[PDB]
Design a binder for these strands. Sequence first.
RNA 1: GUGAACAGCCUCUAGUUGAUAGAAUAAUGUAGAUAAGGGAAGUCGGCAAAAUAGAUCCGUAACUUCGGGAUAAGGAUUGGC
RNA 2: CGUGGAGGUCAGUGACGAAGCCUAGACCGUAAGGUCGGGUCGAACGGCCUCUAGUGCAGAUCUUGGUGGUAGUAGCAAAUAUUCAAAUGAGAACUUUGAAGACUGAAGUGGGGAAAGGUUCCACGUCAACAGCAGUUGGACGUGGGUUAGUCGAUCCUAAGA
RNA 3: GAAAUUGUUGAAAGGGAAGGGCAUUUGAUCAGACA
Lengths: 62, 107, 49, 178
Amino acid sequence: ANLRTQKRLAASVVGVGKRKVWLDPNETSEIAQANSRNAIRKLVKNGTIVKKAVTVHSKSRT
Amino acid sequence: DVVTREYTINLHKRLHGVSFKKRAPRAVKEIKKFAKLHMGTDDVRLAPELNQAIWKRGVKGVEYRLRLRISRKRNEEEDAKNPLFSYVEPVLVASAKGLQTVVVEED
Amino acid sequence: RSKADRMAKMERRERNRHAKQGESDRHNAVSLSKHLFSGKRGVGKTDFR
Amino acid sequence: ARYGATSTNPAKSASARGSYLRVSFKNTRETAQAINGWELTKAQKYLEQVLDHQRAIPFRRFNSSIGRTAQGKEFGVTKARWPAKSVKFVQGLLQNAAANAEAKGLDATKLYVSHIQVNQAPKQRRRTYRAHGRINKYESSPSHIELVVTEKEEAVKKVVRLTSRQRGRIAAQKRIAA
RNA sequence: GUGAACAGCCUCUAGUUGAUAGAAUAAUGUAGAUAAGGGAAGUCGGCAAAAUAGAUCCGUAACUUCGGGAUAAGGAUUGGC
RNA sequence: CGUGGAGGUCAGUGACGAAGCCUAGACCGUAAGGUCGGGUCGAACGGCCUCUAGUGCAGAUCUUGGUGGUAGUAGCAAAUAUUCAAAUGAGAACUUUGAAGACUGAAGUGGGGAAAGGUUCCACGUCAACAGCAGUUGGACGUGGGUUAGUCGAUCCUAAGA
RNA sequence: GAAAUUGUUGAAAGGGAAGGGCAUUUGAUCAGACA
């Protein structure tokens, strides 16, 4: 399906940029249904969309 | 005939004198041509763990020898190619040297 | 509705031969532009590189 | 509907057409002459190998500054070429003309392509931009394809005056020769 | 972060992965480079490229409107621990 | 000789096919041109004595419109760069998600605005045209939805000036 | 639904042009007249 709408919309809910949200490729029939911001909250807390924690920029060499 | 074998493949002698922006995309097309020679099929697939094994040292740092596993399988109904296709996938090992081709048994 | 849907596609066709990118492309083609041909180019400053 | 000049029986014949097809025209003329006159079931086997770089369409007329190739030795031409978008329409009409001959009930193996014709269609006027603010055209060349397949049919007293002297000559030799 | 620095080079946050593509590696190009021996003999003319280049210390001529000239010239030194 | 109309005459021709157009088919005239056969066609048009002119084309770097040769040719080469699998689909180098790989590197390819544009923003349906290749995607097409102020602005005051 | 221009079929020609004039051969085609 086409999932750019929910990719954008889950960036605004979680509060991270579009580069960090993760939409699983096996549950592609579930996420295509969710079309409101309200349902995107439901797709987060059951574990379908996750956050992808920050790329490390260590300071041990400095 | 479902047959699964092992192979090393010398990507040093095949990527000789290629531009650096096209070494890793050429090494993908070299493996699709390598599977056509031994198995005799046109549909060749590459598992994404093999794609990570080529592109790990950037575009211009493709390894000299890979250690591949090629499975020849049956194809599904209403495909008009042929009923057989290869599936190239990597087997990780410490050194790719000193290993010759081995027929893998099935179970 | 299917009869009037056909009468749209019978009368759109003349605009697609002129490659109108809408039904609202009425940019008119000039026959001859003045700054190309109305001059005598000699020694000195001229009108283009 | 108003085909070209045909020399055949319209009883044992099927036909197909394609109009306003947004192709190149010069690429579809040369792929029509390559297939003209052949047998229908060998023609469909031919166009598959054009798409797989086995056999080539020879360019006879519209062939200036074409690169040389090796596969035209079958035809005695050095210049040939494998147009993909021309064949995907032309075999689209061979697949149409077969099913038209299926509906009438004509023979499967005796069927061959006899008349095939391609001519110009009205061009799509589109514009581009050049130096010094000049506007030049950038237009297409669509085409009308039409063809007729036909069953092969296995088949392939002038009065004379002469004078009274020339009458008497044959009558003389008949008298002598017994 | 290196550094005198908002220079140049690499990365985090956010963003893009768009600019028709494949196969070969002839000549002539465009853009970027290197070269023994000699060093402007080339040429309208050292045009181009090369050379010198940051910092520390030493040392600085004619001339002068006494302010300059001056980073004049020229010479030593630089990592790691 | 031929053309557009005009007065008169042939009680002219014609849906049983008038005018036109095509016609290496025929006949007459030195020639301008005239007549006939065939095919196409579908509603008006000729002979002759006279009158009248916006009455005869190969050129004018002629006017407008249309189409060629060159030619499937020059070309689509700045901005470091793309790769595999699955889903969707009649069809995927280009769409979508995921796995890798890279770049802009805080005087950015980031986040807001002033002039300026005017519904492009968002959803749904969908690919004839357009995005100089493609296309299932789009700032395209079809239909709808969306901008909420006692405090942010205008309105108010004066500047150079009208 | 004319011409430029083009497609297929049919005929014909062709060693660095093509087209034209007089004259005939060959090939295709055709009107007239003989009661």
